[PDB]
Amino acid sequence: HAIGYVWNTLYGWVDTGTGSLAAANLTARMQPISHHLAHPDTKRRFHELVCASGQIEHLTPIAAVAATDADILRAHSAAHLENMKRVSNLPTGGDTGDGITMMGNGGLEIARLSAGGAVELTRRVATGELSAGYALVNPPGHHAPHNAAMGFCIFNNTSVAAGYARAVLGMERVAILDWDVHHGNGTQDIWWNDPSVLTISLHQHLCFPPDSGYSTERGAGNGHGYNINVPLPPGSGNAAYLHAMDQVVLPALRAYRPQLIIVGSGFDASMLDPLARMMVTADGFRQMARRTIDCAADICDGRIVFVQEGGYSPHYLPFCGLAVIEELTGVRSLPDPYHEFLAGMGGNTLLDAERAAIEEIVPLLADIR
Amino acid sequence: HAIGYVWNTLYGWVDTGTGSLAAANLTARMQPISHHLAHPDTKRRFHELVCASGQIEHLTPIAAVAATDADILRAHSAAHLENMKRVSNLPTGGDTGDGITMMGNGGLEIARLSAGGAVELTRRVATGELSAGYALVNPPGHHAPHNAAMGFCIFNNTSVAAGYARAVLGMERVAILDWDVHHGNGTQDIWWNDPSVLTISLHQHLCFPPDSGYSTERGAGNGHGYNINVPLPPGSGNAAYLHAMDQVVLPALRAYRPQLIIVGSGFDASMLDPLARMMVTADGFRQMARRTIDCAADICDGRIVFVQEGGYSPHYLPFCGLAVIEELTGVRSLPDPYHEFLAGMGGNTLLDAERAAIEEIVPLLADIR
Amino acid sequence: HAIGYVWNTLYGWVDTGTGSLAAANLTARMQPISHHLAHPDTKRRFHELVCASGQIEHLTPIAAVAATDADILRAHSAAHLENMKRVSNLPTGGDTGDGITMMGNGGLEIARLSAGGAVELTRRVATGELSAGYALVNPPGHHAPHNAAMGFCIFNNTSVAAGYARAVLGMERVAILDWDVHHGNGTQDIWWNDPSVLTISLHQHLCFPPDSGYSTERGAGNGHGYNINVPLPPGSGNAAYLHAMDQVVLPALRAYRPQLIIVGSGFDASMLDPLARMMVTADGFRQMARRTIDCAADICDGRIVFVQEGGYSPHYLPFCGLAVIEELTGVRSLPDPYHEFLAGMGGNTLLDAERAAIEEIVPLLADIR
Amino acid sequence: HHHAIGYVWNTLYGWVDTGTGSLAAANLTARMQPISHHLAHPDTKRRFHELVCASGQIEHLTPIAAVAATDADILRAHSAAHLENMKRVSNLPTGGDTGDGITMMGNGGLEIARLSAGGAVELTRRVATGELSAGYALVNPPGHHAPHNAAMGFCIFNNTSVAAGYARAVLGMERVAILDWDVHHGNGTQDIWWNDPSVLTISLHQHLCFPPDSGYSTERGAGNGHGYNINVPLPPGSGNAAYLHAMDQVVLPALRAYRPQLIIVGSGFDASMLDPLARMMVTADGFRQMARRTIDCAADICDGRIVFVQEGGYSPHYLPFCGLAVIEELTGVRSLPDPYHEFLAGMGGNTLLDAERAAIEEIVPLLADIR
Ligand SMILES: O=C(/C=C/c1ccc(/N=N/c2ccccc2)cc1)NO
Ligand SMILES: O=C(/C=C/c1ccc(/N=N/c2ccccc2)cc1)NO
Ligand SMILES: O=C(/C=C/c1ccc(/N=N/c2ccccc2)cc1)NO
Ligand SMILES: O=C(/C=C/c1ccc(/N=N/c2ccccc2)cc1)NO
Ligand SMILES: [K+]
Ligand SMILES: [K+]
Ligand SMILES: [K+]
Ligand SMILES: [K+]
Ligand SMILES: [K+]
Ligand SMILES: [K+]
Ligand SMILES: [K+]
Ligand SMILES: [K+]
Ligand SMILES: [Zn+2]
Ligand SMILES: [Zn+2]
Ligand SMILES: [Zn+2]
Ligand SMILES: [Zn+2]
């Protein structure tokens, strides 16, 4: 039991610009605002709560090491890397291609530290120095496919980490479990043809991106059957999420027998998130983390690495993230002060449409060898 | 003919404090934040868009007139009025009662101007000077019952306005249609025994408060049948809302034949709102407004007054509000720049559970004489 | 009689980006920040106080009308106008030339409204519809010379107004009195050879720009003697400023007999300004305004137009501006709540070095015909 | 190429709730509109901390955890009555002002005030007794305006006096110096040690900037403490030349005469060229030279024992570079330019003006009475 924790100051310095989502735009009458939806303060407040709560005293700080060009090229194209260097070199940075993904001047340095934080924690868990950990990285990763930045993501951090373990550590099988509320299309893309990385995405159906995350997207060639999408309807809460964990996610992991589990740990499924419509509470994320850590203990010697994805409530995300940290440390010392306010809103009964969405995926488990 | 518009600078000066929802609290480790969820910038950004878009050139600006004690006592108890001016007269103000509802020293001035904005616009529409209008007030109203402040609401603005229309203008029947995503419990309470003010609330079921808004809440005594709740499931979008408008709301208004329609116009049912889980877009709000305004044209010579309630997306609320203003002016000159991004997310299909929730209410129409 | 007042919502929407002064830059480790020093909220808070104080009920609101190409060319070169059109048309705008003055895409719209606010107010004062007024414009103007943007100024608003007054309003003489704390180098340049616009600048010596504002800069050719710089030492307060008004500025205006006085009204000489080291309080600005308005009454039928320049204290600038507005309206209804706090800090004694700096300018007065 | 340099930051220093006003509270009747960042908002000091980390300076520092100041610690500098009153405000559901109408605190805010004073104490404990050579305690809230019996001017407890008190009573040092270069007069520190020659208190400040009624050169202490308080009031517009002249002519000679066993620096950066709360012209290079001179003095006279403790400073833009310059002088690692250097160097302040010279000359005769 030693739990690694990655925070780098520059994770809080990501420049999301002066827009809300896209850039500010006078002709469209999109007024500038101080905090873009993805502003780094949300994740910084999570870090600061980790410290102020005293959880930091039970964690082993791990320094990020910047990802090299060669590290990035394991997961991404040369053109993509060149384009990110171009944008980062501009005097005020700029949009990276999709119109909602700003990088500041010099912001490539932070993207390298974000991917490198995930890699470094993976490395140190795999040696046995650490039993597990949480890499509280920013910018996020899971939307970025081989040849682009997308959806606030510059490089696919979890895929860079999985690529490292496969290339360097002699790991035959790795699983990436993504519970960010948005479809992990980038991760799905990168490993589409590859059975050596089982990619699972639990998400709100068609939330982002628009035309993806269907359960019929199962990979190709040798990789067919090694991508599992679990699209859930808007309004799904703890009961639906936990049913999905018990009926689909955990059985998939046990069938596949990964040697390492990487969690794309977003908190944008929270009850208070502006960028999705789900009803998960901190206690829901707690139970999700507890189940996944316990699964890792059973099947891969406890080797589990959490890597921050999205989440957009500066108010509530810190308590969602703290719950996961407490499940790693085993020190449960602070309440969720929003518990009683949120518990009365619902989401804790499994609805028939939620049950049916999960049942659609159960047959795909038979094809995991 | 002429459309009134109320904005007062002090609506943007409401001091929501340094907490997120409740106050910042060091022992709970709730870190202070610049913008409380209910910070006035959200509604100020709506006002600024009304101006910057050119909509202000098609509106007649109407100054708020502070609500008198006489005005406030038509909706509220003598003890409540005394208690707010007791609280406002305290050296730094204080707690109105529920732990999420601030008032500053002299913050009664803003509460009076908010209610008075609704009254003054009502007076000018109901007397025939204006055809209709929008009062972009703050603080909001609909959670304040006869004897208390609640859920960010000091006085029940729409009920103060309805009370004025009844007692001063001699209207025999008024309807208040509340499409803020939270249950209008305050409005329901005030008029509970009174068939002369038909109160309708469309809302996310049990979102806030956690214990009201059931469709069994129908009024009492002579008021029985003149309160209609339409609780909707989380995830409901444009399709559910428009189905509710056509199957329940418009028929209720036609059966009742109000001489004035007041709309409690919240935008917290929007797709990007943190404080509910609904999926309405600016186009949904546009169609809701168009339907209600056309109903008013048919049954009460177009006498319709919109009064701002909640809504918590500083990014997207301005476009939701602008769409409603455009339906009043008839000048549709600015695209919603979020439309394509949000359209893909859904909410645009009437789901069986949404339809069933609305169908439960249809039999209640028979009792509206 | 009537006092005109210009505010346009877009003046508050100028996007100053994510840096402090220059852009954020990660190599330099200049961390992004929400409010650039020149963020438009400072001027917006002045506008909001004009309204909240009740001064707006004593003012005649005057809509800004976009400055035309012909208007701009009375102060600037064809090349500069075309370059601003070029930068504003770029997909995400850009650098206007100096590395720090930026325009967003379509930002030319705001620059035209800023200059056009000054023009429209000037027209309506000159015709006698209004006796005087205040144009609370943004972006500012006085650093922009004939052939460039500079120091966050796109067009020289007061020179566009002066040029309009000369060519369209028939005025043979105009004076521009600039009491922004920084040297009005742009205004000086534009009218350098022209005795028909007397240009006066009171400023902190070498504050910005670093190499101009010496009292030896007196114009050339027919314009020799018709530019007057009054550089003052850091730490100069109410005593120095009022002595400079009494000994130099008012005598210059009286000797010149302008038909209109345009004031470049900055408040960055205030006691709490980050971007200069001067000690002027709201009462100092009040007295400067009272004196200049009274001078206008004596020499040009009261024709005086105030046009906003700089000022960077969001806390205190609103009260400095309000004091000027109160001298225009004659309604003195709110105290400066900082009065006692700032009065104790000094600046209210004429120091020998301050007296000496002002006495250096006196011989230049003899040459004004 | 350096010995161990202690550094104190605690997350809660960044969580001090300064409210919704500018200076005093927001006030509707006065028409003081609410604002996100109060002048004294903790982000300014947090931006300094984050630059220490992002610049790589943190790799050359020894992080030292704050230890909460105990009642006994606070009572070496303050009255029992003052300690008791800070508890009450700290219990209020949203906190409140503590006395003077500009000194906001929270429910629980005493926790942070104890951690601020305790950061100064803990660094002092480790520097004295030789574990560390020197250090910087980047604390918040600040200290120097709080006198024996009150909170004042954003200060709850007098952090540097709590540290000096510990050094005197617990470590048994006979002589301590507190050098305060925050731009405002250190009236609280002056008050606490007024009668006491065992703590030499020096304050460089803008004359009558804050408070409005103190900091004259005739305030020299009383009784056995007569001659062991030295004020150097300077005129508005004073810059690097004035401050370095003051260091060379008054401050450093005073320290050499007094022979303190420990030098505590009340390290504010509100004398900077871009500060809203004073009218001085010091640049980061100025603060660099001031720090270099003071550390070298400590090396000469008290075995290098020097503890910097954060006081004021209100430019979130520029303060981090001023603070970083001081940190670089402690580590000897000079890896980042001041990006404002050229912009500010043209503004002046680097020539000694006659009135500046005169203000400093007035104080030189007081050096004769330091025994
Ligand atoms: O955490 C995340 C980020 C998700 C996400 C990112 C960006 C989104 N984009 N929105 C817009 C809005 C308006 C116009 C164009 C695009 C939508 C979702 N996913 O994991
Ligand atoms: O627009 C609205 C918003 C209603 C609303 C009402 C109550 C809320 N309070 N939440 C909390 C959270 C934590 C602790 C106590 C209370 C938050 C939002 N009504 O229309
Ligand atoms: O009110 C004003 C302020 C003008 C002003 C002009 C230029 C400025 N440039 N500042 C920098 C700062 C850092 C690096 C380069 C340049 C900063 C302020 N003019 O009237
Ligand atoms: O760093 C500092 C700043 C001190 C400071 C002290 C007192 C201050 N008082 N401000 C006001 C302003 C308005 C009304 C009452 C009081 C403002 C600043 N001291 O070291
Ligand atoms: K795969
Ligand atoms: K996912
Ligand atoms: K009723
Ligand atoms: K409702
Ligand atoms: K001239
Ligand atoms: K000037
Ligand atoms: K002493
Ligand atoms: K001092
Ligand atoms: Zn996401
Ligand atoms: Zn609501
Ligand atoms: Zn200026
Ligand atoms: Zn200070």
Side-chain angles (χ1 to χ4, degrees), chain B residues 15 18 26 29 31 109, chain D residues 15 17 20 28 31 33 111:
Chain B
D15 188 358
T18 60
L26 197 65
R29 301 293 193 235
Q31 183 184 348
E109 183 184 10
Chain D
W15 286 28
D17 188 351
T20 59
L28 206 71
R31 301 295 191 233
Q33 181 187 346
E111 182 183 9

Side-chain angles (χ1 to χ4, degrees), chain C residues 297-321:
Chain C
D298 296 337
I299 76 184
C300 57
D301 301 305
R303 291 189 289 272
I304 182 165
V305 172
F306 291 79
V307 182
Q308 184 65 41
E309 296 286 357
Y312 303 99
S313 177
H315 316 292
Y316 196 47
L317 183 146
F319 293 99
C320 295

Side-chain angles (χ1 to χ4, degrees), chain A residues 21-22 100 142-143 151-152 180 182 208 268 275 310-312, chain B residues 337-338 341:
Chain A
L21 192 34
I100 64 180
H142 69 152
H143 293 311
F152 315 149
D180 181 289
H182 306 105
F208 187 88
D268 41 11
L275 274 172
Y312 304 100
Chain B
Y338 294 83
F341 169 71

Side-chain angles (χ1 to χ4, degrees), chain A residues 10 12-19 24-27 29-32 34-35 39 91-92 105-110, chain C residues 10 12-18 23-27 29-32 34-35 39 44 102 105-110:
Chain A
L10 293 184
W13 288 27
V14 171
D15 191 354
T16 43
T18 57
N25 189 311
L26 208 73
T27 299
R29 301 294 193 232
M30 285 189 288
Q31 185 184 345
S34 294
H35 287 69
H39 188 99
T92 67
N105 170 87
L108 173 60
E109 182 183 2
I110 316 179
Chain C
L10 295 175
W13 288 25
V14 172
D15 189 356
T16 45
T18 63
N25 187 104
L26 189 51
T27 296
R29 298 293 192 244
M30 286 189 280
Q31 183 183 350
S34 296
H35 292 244
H39 192 282
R44 183 173 57 80
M102 305 299 279
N105 174 84
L108 179 60
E109 183 185 18
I110 316 182

